[PDB]
Amino acid sequence: MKSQWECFLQNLGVWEGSFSNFSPEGTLLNDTSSRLCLEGLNNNQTVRLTLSRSGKDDVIREFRSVGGGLLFFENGSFSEGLIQLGPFSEFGGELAFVHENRRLRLVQLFDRNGHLNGLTLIREHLAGTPVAERPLLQINDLLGEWRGQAVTIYRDLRPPDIYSTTLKIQLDDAGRLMQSTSFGERTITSTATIKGSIVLFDQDPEKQVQVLLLPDGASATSPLKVQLRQPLFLEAGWLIQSDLRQRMIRSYNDKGEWVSLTLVTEERV
Ligand SMILES: [Cl-]
Ligand SMILES: [Cl-]
Numbered sequence: 001m002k003s004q005w006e007c008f009l010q011n012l013g014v015w016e017g018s019f020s021n022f023s024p025e026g027t028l029l030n031d032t033s034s035r036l037c038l039e040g041l042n043n044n045q046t047v048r049l050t051l052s053r054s055g056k057d058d059v060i061r062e063f064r065s066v067g068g069g070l071l072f073f074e075n076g077s078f079s080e081g082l083i084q085l086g087p088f089s090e091f092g093g094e095l096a097f098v099h100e101n102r103r104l105r106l107v108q109l110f111d112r113n114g115h116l117n118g119l120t121l122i123r124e125h126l127a128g129t130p131v132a133e134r135p136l137l138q139i140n141d142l143l144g145e146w147r148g149q150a151v152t153i154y155r156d157l158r159p160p161d162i163y164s165t166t167l168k169i170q171l172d173d174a175g176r177l178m179q180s181t182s183f184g185e186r187t188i189t190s191t192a193t194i195k196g197s198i199v200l201f202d203q204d205p206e207k208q209v210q211v212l213l214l215p216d217g218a219s220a221t222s223p224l225k226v227q228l229r230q231p232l233f234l235e236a237g238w239l240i241q242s243d244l245r246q247r248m249i250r251s252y253n254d255k256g257e258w259v260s261l262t263l264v265t266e267e268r269v
Contacts, residue, residue, distance in 0.1 A: 002074050004157070008047070008066050010076025012038050014127035015103055019053065024116040024222075026197040026212050032056065036124065069093075071153055071261045079248060081234065083155075085256030091226045095236035095248040096122075101129035106220055106236040114226030116210070123216050134217035134239060139177065139194060141217070141239055142169050148266030150183060155258060165264050183264075209235075217245075229254050243268035 014037050021030040033054040040047055051059040072078040081093020091114060096105040107120035125131050135141070146167040153160045163184035170178050172191065177199055180189040190207045192199045199211040202224060212220045217239030223232060232252040239245045247264040 004066050004070075004072050007072035007074055007076060008063075008070075008078070009040060009044055010072075010074070010098065011078075011103075012040055012044075012047070014038075015124035016127050017122065017124040017131075020121045020123070020215075022119045022121060022214065024118065024210075024212070026214055029118075034122070034124070035127070069258070071155065073151065073153065073261075073263050075099075077246075077248070077263060079234075079250045079261050081250060081258065083258050085226075085232070085252060089256075091223070091232060091234070093234050093250050095234065095250065097236075097238045097240075097246055097248065099238075099240050099246075101126040102132055104216055104218055104238045106214075106218060108220055108222060108234055108236075110222075110226055114223070116222040119212070119214075119220055121214060121216070121218060133215075136215050137213040137217050137219055137239055139169075139171075139199070139213070141242070142245075143171065144169065145269040146245060146266040147269055148264060150262050150264040152260050152262040154260050165266055167266060232256070 014035065016035050018031050018033050020028060022028055035052045037050040038047055045064065047063045049061040066072065069083050070078060070080050076098040078096045079094060082089055085091060090112065091110040092108050094105055094107045096103060103124040105122035108116060109118045111117040123133065148165050150163045150165050151160050152163070166182035168180040172178050177192040177194055179192060180187060188206050190201050190204045192201045197213045201207040201209045208224045209221050210224060214220065219237040221235035226232060231254045234250040235247060237245060237247045245266050249262040250258065251260045251262065253259050
């Protein structure tokens with residue numbers, strides 16, 4: 001549909017909120033209030049970015065194109081990160097959801113040993129609109145069944161693919177979490193243990209991840225360890241309303257090349 005530039009322009013406006021650094025266990029370490037102005041110039045052929053943060057100098061950037069490590073969906077949602085991973089290029093990147101007057105942008109940061117080191121949660125509302133903070137995410141907010149659709153877009157900008165999704169999450173008896181996720185023709189069903197704000201999947205070679213539950217209905221799903229010659233998936237989620245959730249997945253092949261980005265929108269059944 002829209003060109004990538006036109007998708008990017010969906011973000012124009014004044015986004016107020018904060019940039020918040022969390023530990024890999026979900027502890028708030030540092031938060032700084034922010035105002036990010038994205039304005040179009042010269043018939044929207046240039047975008048000027050003015051990022052003001054409390055106690056910091058302004059950052060001003062101007063863009064005449066998007067590409068590289070960025071891909072956008074038609075509603076302006078996007079992901080940013082590295083194109084090619086390797087010895088000095090740590091895993092990480094940003095998943096950025098746009099919805100009405102809000103953005104929720106989640107950055108994951110991995111260390112040199114391939115372990116999650118920190119996250120940044122950027123919760124933004126349009127200037128003059130409500131803060132509209134969602135509740136801290138709880139397991140109980142997710143239990144049940146979810147159904148929806150996913151769009152996968154590609155770096156070569158070959159045509160998008162569309163898939164059906166199902167997500168079922170239930171406690172077993174036991175008190176462990178059972179999660180069954182369908183994505184097109186693929187279903188993966190795995191049990192997890194819950195330890196506070198972290199859900200741990202460590203049994204199945206197809207699901208070696210920690211899920212961290214965060215403020216504003218956010219979640220981050222992280223590889224337990226970034227391994228050589230394995231494909232990698234950076235994932236975040238946002239429970240936008242009690243019965244509406246999006247998930248975003250930035251996908252890397254086992255050569256460490258970024259290949260695609262997927263946005264799932266699902267509703268509670
Ligand atoms: Cl103009
Ligand atoms: Cl997630």
